[PDB]
Amino acid sequence: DSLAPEDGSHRPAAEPTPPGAQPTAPGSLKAPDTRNEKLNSLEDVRKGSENYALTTNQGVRIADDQNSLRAGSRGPTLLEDFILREKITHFDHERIPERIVNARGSAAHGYFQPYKSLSDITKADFLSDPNKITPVFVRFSTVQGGAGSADTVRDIRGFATKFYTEEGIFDLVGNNTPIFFIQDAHKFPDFVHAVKPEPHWAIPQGQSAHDTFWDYVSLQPETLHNVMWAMSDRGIPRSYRTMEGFGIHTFRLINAEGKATFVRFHWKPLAGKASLVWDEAQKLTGRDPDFHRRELWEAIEAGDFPEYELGFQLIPEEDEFKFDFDLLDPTKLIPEELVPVQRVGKMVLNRNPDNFFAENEQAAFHPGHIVPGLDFTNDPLLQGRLFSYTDTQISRLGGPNFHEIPINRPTCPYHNFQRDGMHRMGIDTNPANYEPNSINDNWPRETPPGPKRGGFESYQERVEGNKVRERSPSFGEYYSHPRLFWLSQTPFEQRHIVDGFSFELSKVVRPYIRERVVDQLAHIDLTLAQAVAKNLGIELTDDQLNITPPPDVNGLKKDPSLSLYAIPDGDVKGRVVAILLNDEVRSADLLAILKALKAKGVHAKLLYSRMGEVTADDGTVLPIAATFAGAPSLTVDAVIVPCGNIADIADNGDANYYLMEAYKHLKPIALAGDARKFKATIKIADQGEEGIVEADSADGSFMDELLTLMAAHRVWSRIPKIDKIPA
Amino acid sequence: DSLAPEDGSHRPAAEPTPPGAQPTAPGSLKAPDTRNEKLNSLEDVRKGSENYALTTNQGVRIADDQNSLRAGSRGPTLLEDFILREKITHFDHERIPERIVNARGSAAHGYFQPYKSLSDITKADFLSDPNKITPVFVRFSTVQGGAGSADTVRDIRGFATKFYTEEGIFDLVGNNTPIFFIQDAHKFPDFVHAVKPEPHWAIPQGQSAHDTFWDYVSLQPETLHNVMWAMSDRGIPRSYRTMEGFGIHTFRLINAEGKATFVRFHWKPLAGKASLVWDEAQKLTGRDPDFHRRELWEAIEAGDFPEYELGFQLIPEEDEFKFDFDLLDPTKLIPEELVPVQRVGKMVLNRNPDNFFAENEQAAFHPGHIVPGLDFTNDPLLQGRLFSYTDTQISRLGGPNFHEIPINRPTCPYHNFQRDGMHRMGIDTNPANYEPNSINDNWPRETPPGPKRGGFESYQERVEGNKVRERSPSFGEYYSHPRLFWLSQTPFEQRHIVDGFSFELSKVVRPYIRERVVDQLAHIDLTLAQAVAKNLGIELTDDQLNITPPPDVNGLKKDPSLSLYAIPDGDVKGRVVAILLNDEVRSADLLAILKALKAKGVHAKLLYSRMGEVTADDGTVLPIAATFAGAPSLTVDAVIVPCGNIADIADNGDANYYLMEAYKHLKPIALAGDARKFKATIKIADQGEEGIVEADSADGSFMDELLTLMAAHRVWSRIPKIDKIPA
Amino acid sequence: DSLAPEDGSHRPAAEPTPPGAQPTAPGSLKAPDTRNEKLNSLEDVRKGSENYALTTNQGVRIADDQNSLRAGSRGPTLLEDFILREKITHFDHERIPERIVNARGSAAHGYFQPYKSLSDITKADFLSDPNKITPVFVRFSTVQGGAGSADTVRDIRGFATKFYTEEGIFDLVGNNTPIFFIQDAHKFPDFVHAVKPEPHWAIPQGQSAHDTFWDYVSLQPETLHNVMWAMSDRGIPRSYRTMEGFGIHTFRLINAEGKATFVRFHWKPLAGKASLVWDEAQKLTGRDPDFHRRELWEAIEAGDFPEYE
Amino acid sequence: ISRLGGPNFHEIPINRPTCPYHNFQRDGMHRMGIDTNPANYEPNSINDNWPRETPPGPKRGGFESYQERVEGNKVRERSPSFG
Ligand code: HEM
Ligand code: HEM
Ligand code: HEM
Structure with missing residues (x-):
């Protein structure tokens, strides 16, 4: 109809922009130049829209997409309306079963690159050349809640990485804590049923705060380690960019010579470690249940790419039994004071998906997807995981050909004698569908193990004992x-x-x-x-x-x-600061605040008691991002109040409350000139206190003090002070 | 490896070869240059094999595809064998539900082209110009039997054509008889349950000869007309190339002026009409249950392309009630004496598929898939057909995106706001998934109906009456x-x-x-x-x-x-002749026989009582296609026995039976020189019999009387004489 | 309504009758006195029909089961016809995937009874008591063909028995030849792909007589023992009543003391061993593709119960 | 049918009518009912046409749609x- 506004304002700028500045959009519309080999190979399935005629699934042009076909404009709908029928039919079948566990997750595309060849210890092709780039797709998640639950619950987070290597997909499916709750995969269904919503009424969502979880924990002490981790601040990260990642289990590296080494996989957040505080995390599930998803997405559109260092803890075969705990026991961590993490490579996440359903919801990771150079161990939890995943994925995705869904495919097409199954996309032409065959001269063929590009051989670990449970x-x-x-x-x-x-x-x-x-x-x-x-x-x-x-x-x-x-x-x-405006902000303070924030890559959001604009003392028109109630302090890392007509907001309940909630949650607060009248709101002495930056104006010094507090994330020394204020 | 023979005789030649000359092969290997737009757009999904490494579905190379992973070579299989599990899992899920009706079917790729423009009567784009070439995919089938039942049963035959036009897919889903058994789609499940295998024991397969069918027919006299056609020789086609095709229902053609014309669709076989005889037909369900499927594929590999003329019976709107039957009643035909069929174009099937499963089994046809220029009518059977197909296709194929299976896709990509569903292959980038929208400027957009490239508009037929059953x-x-x-x-x-x-x-x-x-x-x-x-x-x-x-x-x-x-x-x-050899064949006859057959494109199979070869009287060395019992007379159209050492086979019971069978089934028999000894086995008088070619040698003349008989298909005058032939 | 004949000859006698004397019927109507524990517990799910009104799946009675709802007797069908939609919808969803292998099969209910107690060698509850009977459910089948394929093909036959014991279901999943074609389960999909219809044209049905099978066999000599049995008359039995059956693998029997014994399982047809000859078997696939299924069902209805030791 | 798994979702306990239903519909994924009707179609003479259609009436009659007059052209x- 030509409904867009004559001005182009409905479409974001295809360049890095700050969070809240432009409508967010599909990855390849937002950052068309961010490319990699996997992202390039997806171009054949991306579909455009602009300038095309609206059609049915069979390509027939639609004239009227507003109405059903009927006998008279007020008459009965006719069964012969095949256009209405296809539209409703597709809609009626949109949904697929969500993952049993980790149904709530957010994902992005990026690349990995090793710092040096690791050929001495592994023949894995993706670790052999620092000038070589392996495309990745990462999915972060919660564990217990549905696909529609909240991000900032207390819980363990999943951290899954799919590496599209030159010798196959390698999926590193780990979590944000170095151990798991249970030892043997046989108990996965008992543990998960205990933490999930109780069966009679399906309550509670996204929470372990209920009887069944604690009954189970109280009867199975092997769980206490991971329970400590979840009960801590580790359970409620500030963002997916600011938490660690762990493979958990002990795996094997295998070099070209056949030497096996034990390894535990680590991811170090290059943005550092940071978490919320419980009251803040719980409230944030109400005010913005999509906070982690949004933050990850906006971080990528702003150019603050989530960056992580892949690191290895390495344990020679001869030291297997040299610890107090069993290396193959997944409830046990390996202290870095005993076995240091060696830096291996860097992963950068620099492009969002185009369609969450197509790429995120249909993505399938499996810890059994390993490549030559890696191998398992007898860890009993890992061993039983080796059976799940594929099983669950066919149920969830519709068939055994789910490896043909675009996001899941290797960068180089596979060749094998597997045929048919629901929704087969490849059309096989090999005369032979079995091997050994003579009618295709045995192709495709087996490939002996070797140093590079050889076939997969398991490490010949010795097995000795009786068949026992x-x-x-x-x-x-x-x-x-x-x-x-x-x-x-x-x-x-x-x-x-x-x-x-x-x-x-x-x-x-x-x-x-x-x-x-x-x-x-x-x-x-x-x-x-x-x-x-x-x-x-x-x-x-x-x-x-x-x-x-x-x-x-x-x-x-x-x-x-x-x-x-x-x-x-x-x-x-990548952090963000809330700036509480008034109806006559001293533009000198604002100029100084914004430029200082911007120099360190910190974002700001201009907040007021209404939407629209406010005009600063010199006539500068300041556009408002959101209201006080609309973008609460829970969503920012710190608050700054500039001088101006402070009387405009000093009696605003929402304005005052904003500082009380932020003060309660240990965040840095900065008050300029007359903004210092808010000190009374948060009971700050005349003297002042650590964690509250105050001055006659928002000069250079003032901004450096605020930024230093931001570098230490929260004002822990404020803890005893918060007890008393009612917030 | 190198399992293939050094001569290279595992591969068939990539040139047209006669039936049984070479091993059959996937269309793209057999005829790589036979192409059309649809065939060429499937190229992105065709997979090779030769010279590739064997890999998992994730692209990991397999070293040993002979053995499961175990603890010791006589030990238990280990859960960690992800290679075995992947292979077994996919095997475990190969099968999909067969079609509810018309499960048994055979298909081929081809193209259609109009003889002249039909724009005075329809705006359908594919009928608009004789230079407009439309790719097609046709599936012929039986009705009652399972996917594994026999081809030559007595049954109605389905004749489905998928037209890949430039304005969308139009599926012409017909049968080979001009009417159907019932009038209202409400009774389809009753009729089909009556003809299908009885529910307590699931017998019989591919037969209407059981009590429930005949009980329903006796209680529903609307069924009698199609019943007549089924019981006639129309029910046991010689081949899919030699049968007629019909749409059955009266549809509408709509021109650019908006004028409606009633039409019935016909497919006229340019190979002419031919059918077996019951006992031959039933005997052939046991000697070669895949006869029709085999013959279709081999006709094409030989370059004997199945060709059909599209025909239209056109009835002016004003003539709606001019017959003594209802135009809308699908149990009534329109005699060509009253309304002649107008030749409109020709369809040629010239390319077999590469994978039966991927392209034939997964193909989806819908009578509801029409394009601008076509419309329905109130025929109550066709009306109810529009409540089916789509529904059934989603449970067979596995999801609402089955339109994205390569064989089903329209030639040009479609654009609409439909999203998700299991196995979604398309990655959408539209900022809007609804309309109307301003964020993508309402694209993709509606398109008004018009002369060409316009949106679909139903003919505005007047509906008048009460809601009644x-x-x-x-x-x-x-x-x-x-x-x-x-x-x-x-x-x-x-x-x-x-x-x-x-x-x-x-x-x-x-x-x-x-x-x-x-x-x-x-x-x-x-x-x-x-x-x-x-x-x-x-x-x-x-x-x-x-x-x-x-x-x-x-x-x-x-x-x-x-x-x-x-x-x-x-x-x-394209017909075939069996040539019964002996150890001392008269090579003067063979050459003449073969020179004459090949001039009219008749194929030949050289049959003996053992395999290997025989040596002609002059030393010519003849390869034997099959034995007398291996390729019975039921599989040929005529039998010729050249002179030679007849004593070698005169007491051969298989040789004698071959002629007794061919005789009983009314097929032409040619006998040269001393071959006239076999006359006694089929008790033929000394002066001869019409339908039995006999001469002193196999000269031109003899070959000419044989070819003339074959043009008449069968020797109807022999009927009275087969009675006393114990065969 | 009055569609059945007045003489009542539409209904088969509820007593043992010989092949072709009466129209065959569902077991429970044919032999209502026959019973066992499993047949008795299936009663809560069996449904009658006589004297009941025709209804939708939601229990609404249907008045006219002959017509769709439309605007005028010659007009368009309306979308609001919920009775037509349900009927076509269930019809549209009737089929399920056939089994990957052994899709063509025939089954029947019965019982098992041990001759004596086997507690010395096994603690299995179903073998501990000669007056203890175990309900069973047996399905015989071919291997290569589809569910709609022919019975008397040349092929191996499956012989599967479900034992409903008091301590759990025990399924003895065997064949009619004592060995299998292959050694390692890893090669099952290769082997099966080779015997089944070739991938490009899906020919031939229910036959190992085609290039890929013999190619596989020629490259994998481990297959020659089972091939020998299939090429013999073992490959074309007269009936499922006259063929042997085997578990094939060595399993273990475990007694109360923990003593293990190696065991191979066998089924002996009390009717003795009998097979067809090749040409009779192949012609039979054409004259009566359902010969073994019919034969089995008819033997039971006649009281000639398949008996196996 | 896609959500719950098949055309027999009416047989999941919570969805079943209180009185058993009777018709000629058969098979489908997860079929719980075991039909013994000799006939799976109607009209049939082998089960004397049962189960049967019931005319509409005041109480316990078959469903009959109200006969609303329909008048107009086929339009979107x-x-x-x-x-
Ligand atoms: C060290 C212990 C484990 C870790 C670190 C772990 C990690 C994960 C992660 C991160 C996901 C979500 C992947 C995504 O974003 O799609 C996931 C999913 C899943 N996990 Fe594991 N898990 C563990 C143990 C287990 C066990 C013991 C089992 C069962 C044998 C199991 C079964 C599953 C299943 C069935 C899924 C759903 C996958 C899908 O639908 O694609 N997990 N797990
Ligand atoms: C003039 C009457 C009819 C004709 C000529 C006809 C023709 C056909 C043909 C040729 C096929 C097979 C297409 C293929 O090769 O895949 C087919 C399939 C089918 N027909 Fe029709 N049919 C008729 C009536 C009906 C009716 C009245 C219904 C239900 C109301 C129906 C339901 C179906 C279904 C469910 C399939 C299977 C579709 C699939 O799984 O792809 N048919 N029919
Ligand atoms: C000693 C060797 C084997 C024997 C005697 C055997 C026997 C059978 C039988 C009798 C059936 C049909 C049961 C019925 O009536 O439903 C069957 C089905 C099947 N078999 Fe086995 N089989 C053997 C080897 C294998 C192997 C090695 C595999 C896979 C690794 C396999 C996979 C299957 C599958 C997938 C089915 C289909 C079952 C269903 O869908 O319910 N078979 N087999």
Whole structure:
């Protein structure tokens, strides 16, 4: 109809722009030049739209897409309207089953590149040449909730990477915590059923705060390690860009000589580690249930590409038994103070998808998708995972040919004797559909193992024992890793952990379940146990108070790599600041604030009590991003209030509340000139306090103080001060 | 490896070769230069094989495809064998549901072209110019049987054509008889359940000769007309090349002025019409159940392209009620005496598929797929057909994106706002997935109806009446069309119809049902009635004898276009002759025989009592295509026995039976020199018999009498003489 | 309504009758007194028909099952005809994928009874008591052909028995020859692809007589033992009642003490062994493609019950 | 049918009518009912046409649509009164 506005304002600029600045859009419309080989091979299935006639699926042009065919304009719909019928039919079949676990996820395209050849330890082609680029597709996710639940729940996050190598798809399907809850895959369905919504009423969504989770945990102490991690701030990351990633299981690297090495896979966030605080995370599920999805997407459109360093913990075959814990036990971490992570390569995520359904929702990852140069181990959880995935994927995607869906295909077409199945797209021409054959001179052919481009051979690990359904006795230790984790956290991290356990156990209706969790916490650490106990109105028995603590892990009293914050790794590029305007902002302060933010790659959003524009003292017209209520403090990393007619907003409940919520959630607050009248709102002494930047104006110094606070992410020293303000 | 023979005799030549000369092969390897737009756009999905490494579906190379992974070479299979599991999994899911009806079918690629422009009567783009070449994909099929049943059963045949036009797909989904068994689609599941295998035990396959079929026919006299056609020789085609094709329903052609014309579609075989005889047909379901599928594929590989003339019966709107039957009643035909068929264009099938499953099994046809220039009518069977197809196709193929399976795709990409669904291949980039929208400037957009390239508009037919579940009174006449068909058949064709009803009714267990059918035949024609009654040991009653025959159809009393044979139209090109050899063949006859057959494009198969070769009297070395028992006479159109050492085979029971069988089935037999010794086996008088070529040697003249007989297909005058042939 | 004949000859006698005397019927109407534990528990799902009104799937009675709803008796069919839509819709979805292998098969219900207690060698509840009977469900089949293929082809036959024991279902999934064609399950799809119809033209149905099968056999000599049996008259049995059956693999019997014993399972036809000859078998696929299915069902209706040891 | 898995979704417990339904529809994925009707079509004489159509009436009758008069041309048009 030519409904677009005459001005071109409906379509974003195909260049990197700041979050909130332009309508977001499909990846290849937004960043047409961001390319790689996999992204280039997808061009054959991308479809355009502009300037085409509207058609049926069979190519017939549609004249009237507003009406059904009927006998009279007020008469009955006629069965012969095939156009109406195809439209409703497709719509009626849009949905597919969501993943059993990790149904909520957000994904992006990018590339990986190794720093140096790793040929001495692995013949994996993607690790052999630093001038070589392997396209990747990453999907991050939550675990428990549906595809439509909230992003910022407390939970473990999945972190799956598909590597389209030259010798096959390698999928590195890991999580954001280095261990899992259970030891043997046989218990996956019991554990997952316990954390998922309870069967009689399907409640609660996206939460482990319910009886069944804690019943299970209280009966299966192998779970306490990963439960500590989830109860901590690790359970509620600030963003997918600011969390670690782990393969979890011990795998094998295999070189050209046949030497096998043990490896654990790590991803280090180049943006540093950072998480929200519980009240903030919970509230954020209400105000913006898509916060992680949006943030990841907008980060990529702004050019703040999520960057991660692939790292390896390497353990020679001869040191297999040299630890306190079993290397093949997935509830056990390998302390970096014992086995350091070696830097291997870098992954950059620089393009969003075009169609979430087509690329994200249909993407299929599998930990069994390994390439020559890698191999498994006998880890019993990994071993049972090797059976799931493909199984579930055919159910979910419609057939065994789901490897032909565009996102899932290798960069080089495969050749084998597999035929038919639902929705077969390739048309095979080989005369032979079996091997060995003589009618196609045996093609395609087997390829011996070799140093490069050889066929897949499993490592000839020795196998010895009886056929038994038995847990290895070396896996029977459950409290020493949870304790190592506990001792490595800072004091404010310990309290957050205490509050995580306290909050969750309080949603457990059956009191005895709470008491049993407390009993288990008393086997990890007495100080942890007493503080949780106290929050539940429980007193430990004398016996509980004398439980002897678990042994150290290989003599360690702590390991600082396990804390999010003990060792500062801050980075503010990509963070965002809220700027509370008034109806006559001193433009001098605004100019100084925005330019300083911009120099460090920090984003800003101009907020007011209404939408539209406000005009600064010199006549500068300032466009408003969102209102105070519309873009709450939960969504920003810090707040700045410029001088101006402060009386315009000083009595605005939403304005004041904005600073109270941000102060409560430990965020840096900066007040310029008369904005300092808000100090009374958050009870700040005349003197001032650490975490509150204030001055007569927003000069250079003022912005450097604010940015330094931003580099340390939150104002932990404010904790005792927040207790009292009602917010 | 190198399993193929060093001579290179595993590969068939990429040139037209006669039936059984070379191993058959996928169309693209057999005839790589036979092309059309559709065939060329499928090129992006065709896969090679030669010279490729064997890989998983993820592209990982397989070293050993002979063995499962185990703990020790005599041990248990390990769950971690992802190669085995991938291979078994895909194998586990190969099969998809067969079509509910017309499961058994054979298909080929080709092209259509009009003879002249039809723009005075339709704006359909494919009919607009004789230079407009339209790619087609045709699927011929039986109706009742499963995907694995026999080709030469007695049954109706389906004849489906997919036209890939420049304005969308138009599927012409017809049968090989001009009417259907029932009038309203409400009864399709009742009719089909009655003809299909009975529910308690699932017998019988591919046969209407059981009680439920004949019970339903006896209780539903609307069925009698198509029943007549099925029981005639029309029900047992020689081949898909030698049968007619019909759309059955009256449709509409709409021109650019908006004028509507009623039309019925015809497909006229340029190879002419030909059918087997019942016992040959039933015997052939056991010696070669794939006969028709085989013959179609090999005709094409030989360059004997199946060719059909598209024909239209055109009826002015104003003539709607000018006949003594309803135009909209699908159990009524339109005699070509009353409304002649106008030749409109020709279709040629010239290329077999590459993979049966991918292109034939997954093909989807819909009578509802029409294009501007065409429209429906109120025919109640066609109307209800538009509630089916799509629905069934989504459960067979697996999803609402089956239009994206390569064979089903329109030549040019479609644009609409439909999204997702299982196995979505298209990656959409439109910022808008709805309309109207301003964010993509309302694209893709509607297009008004017009002369060419316009959107679809239904002809505005007036609808008047009450919402009722009621049969039109005009449709209640069930006997005059069956009688017209009966009076138009030759006397041997009449006799074949009697035998069909008699044979079928003999298999009905409940005698009362046999009598109810005979009672129906008495309403059609007394002679047919008595003849069937007599074969069942039934005596017509007094009352049945005085039944007045139904009225003539618009004065007609026969219509030679309804008979298969009344008007000679045979074609010998592509037929096959069996040549019975001996160890001392007279090479003077072979050359002459082969020189004469090849001049009229008749193929030959050299048959002996063992395989390998025989040596001619002059030393010519003859390769044997098959044995007498391996390639029985049922598979040829005529049998020739050249002179030589007849003593070598005169006492061969297989040789003698071959001629007795060919004789009984009315096929031409040629006997040279001492071959006239075989006359005794088929008891032929010394002066000879019309239909038995005999001469002193196989000269030109002898070959000419053989070719002339073959042009007449079968020797109808031998019928009375086969009675006393124990074969 | 009065469609059945007045004499009542539309209905088969509910008693053992010989082949072709009466129209065959569903077992429970043919032999209502026949019973076993599994046949009795299938009762809650069986449905009658006589004297019931015709209804939709939601229980709405149907008045006119002959016509679609339209605007005028000659007018267009309306989308609001929910009775027509349901009927066509269920019809449209009737078929399911056939089995990958063994798609063509015939089955029947029955019972098993051990001659004596086997507790010395196995703790299996179904072999512990001679007065204890186990309901079974057996399906015989060919291997290569589709569900609509012919019975008397030359092929191996499947012999599968479902034991409904008191401690769980035990399925004995065997064949009518004591060995299989291949050694490692990894090659099953290769082998099966070779015997099945060749990929380009989907020919030939229900036959191993084509190039790919013999090619595979010639390159894989492990197949020659089962090939020998298939090329013999074992490949074309007279009936499923007159062929042997085998588990093929060595399994294990475990007693209460934990003592293992190697075992191979066998089925002996009390009717003895009998096969057709090649030409009779091939012509039969043309004259009666359902010969073995018919024969089995008819033997049961006649009281000539398939018996196996 | 796509969501729940087949045309027999009326047989999932929660969806079943209180009184058994009877018709000639057969098969489909996950068929729970075991039909014993000798006939799977109508009209049939082998089960004396059961189950049968029931004429409409005041109580317990077959479904009959109201006979609304239909008048107009086949159009893809919004009624102007809806505007
Ligand atoms: C170390 C332990 C595990 C980790 C790190 C892990 C990780 C993941 C991740 C990240 C995903 C989502 C991938 C995506 O975004 O599509 C996922 C999905 C899944 N996981 Fe695992 N998982 C673990 C254990 C298991 C086990 C023991 C099983 C069962 C044997 C299992 C079964 C599944 C299934 C069935 C899916 C859905 C996949 C799909 O629908 O494509 N997981 N897992
Ligand atoms: C004049 C009457 C009819 C004719 C000539 C006819 C013709 C055909 C043909 C030729 C096919 C097979 C196409 C192929 O090769 O894939 C077919 C399939 C089919 N027909 Fe029709 N048919 C008729 C009536 C009906 C009716 C009344 C219905 C239901 C109301 C129906 C339902 C179907 C279904 C469900 C299929 C299977 C479609 C698929 O799975 O792709 N047919 N019919
Ligand atoms: C000793 C060798 C084997 C024997 C005796 C055997 C026997 C059978 C039988 C009798 C059936 C049909 C059962 C029925 O009536 O439903 C069958 C089905 C089947 N077999 Fe086996 N088979 C053998 C080897 C294999 C192997 C090695 C595989 C795969 C690795 C396999 C996969 C299948 C499949 C996929 C089916 C279809 C079953 C269904 O859909 O319900 N068979 N087999």
